[PDB]
Ligand binder design. Structure first.
Ligand code: 1Q4
Length: 282
């Protein structure tokens, strides 16, 4: 009777797709007929408490409707699993290295526009994402990407400008704006900073040796353990930023630099990025 209800007994694990820290996503076939013709779907579950977190993520995803956000399909049930559409091309981390010859600058900018549109819609629902990275963007096709994970997404209070973070143990610090690193405050403009880092990743086709962590650990030093974040904040205070990726026109690098203004309120917005990209595309 309910198409968003997936019975556990028919949910067959095929393989792993990716891991967060407390959750993983697996490829499954939902095969109620039993002849291996059922649909393939992506299944997020917890690692053996964060049940409430997954439930909150489910309720967020369930109510987002946008062509650049991965489709909620249903739930499999204390314990619960999130069921999403499967995108065979995987994330940008998997896809870009294998399709460099296919994806030129024009196409890269189209991806960037689509990501900005997904993030802008998200911001309009009063959510901050907090995990924007090439690894969380899924490829629907050569012509379309979708933001594909919302494990850290949080609502911002009405008449408040940020969400204050409490659990930060497993933060993606090389994607984080200073206000997040120093004060654990997350503005929509912090997602913008993160978009800047994701855009850099896009422009280097997610080559691991040009990854934001790799390049940042070159600048400051790779062997500071507990002092890494402090040295990262210093670097950003001193105005050091990631360099222009190879083959990236200056005009695109300036858009990127606007995502990286030290003060949140002086950063560009997603609507402005979209305009800047659309102007370079015409
Ligand atoms: O096809 C997919 N659908 C949904 C999520 C997803 C995914 N999610 C990952 C993203 C990185 C964080 C862990 C979950 N990874 C690969 N494919 C898919």
């Amino acid at each position: 009777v309910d198409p968003t209800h997936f019975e556990k007994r028919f949910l067959k694990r095929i393989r792993d797709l990716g891991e967060g820290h407390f959750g993983k996503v697996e490829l499954c076939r939902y095969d109620p007929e039993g002849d291996n013709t059922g649909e393939q779907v992506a299944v997020k579950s917890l690692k053996p408490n964060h049940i409430a977190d997954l439930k909150k993520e489910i309720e967020i995803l369930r109510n987002l409707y946008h062509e650049n956000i991965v489709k909620y399909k249903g739930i499999c049930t204390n314990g619960i699993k999130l069921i999403m559409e499967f995108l065979p091309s995987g994330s940008l981390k998997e896809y870009l290295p294998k399709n460099k010859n296919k994806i030129n600058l024009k196409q890269q900018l189209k991806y960037a526009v689509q990501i900005c549109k997904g993030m802008d819609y998200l911001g309009s629902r009063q959510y901050v994402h907090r995990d924007l990275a090439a690894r969380n963007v899924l490829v629907e096709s050569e012509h379309q990407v979708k933001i594909g994970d919302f494990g850290l997404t949080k609502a911002i209070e009405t008449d408040k400008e940020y969400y204050t973070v409490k659990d930060d143990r497993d933060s993606p610090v090389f994607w984080y704006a200073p206000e997040c690193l120093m004060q654990s405050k997350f503005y929509i403009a912090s997602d913008v900073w993160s978009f800047g880092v994701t855009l850099h990743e896009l422009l280097t086709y997610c080559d691991s040796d040009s990854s934001p962590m790799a390049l940042f650990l070159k600048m400051i030093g790779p062997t500071h353990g507990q002092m890494t974040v402090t040295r990262l904040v210093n670097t950003l205070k001193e105005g050091k930023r990631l360099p222009c990726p190879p083959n990236c026109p200056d005009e695109v690098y300036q858009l990127m630099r606007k995502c990286w203004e030290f003060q949140p309120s002086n950063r560009t917005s997603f609507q402005n990025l979209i305009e800047g990209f659309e102007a370079l595309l015409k």
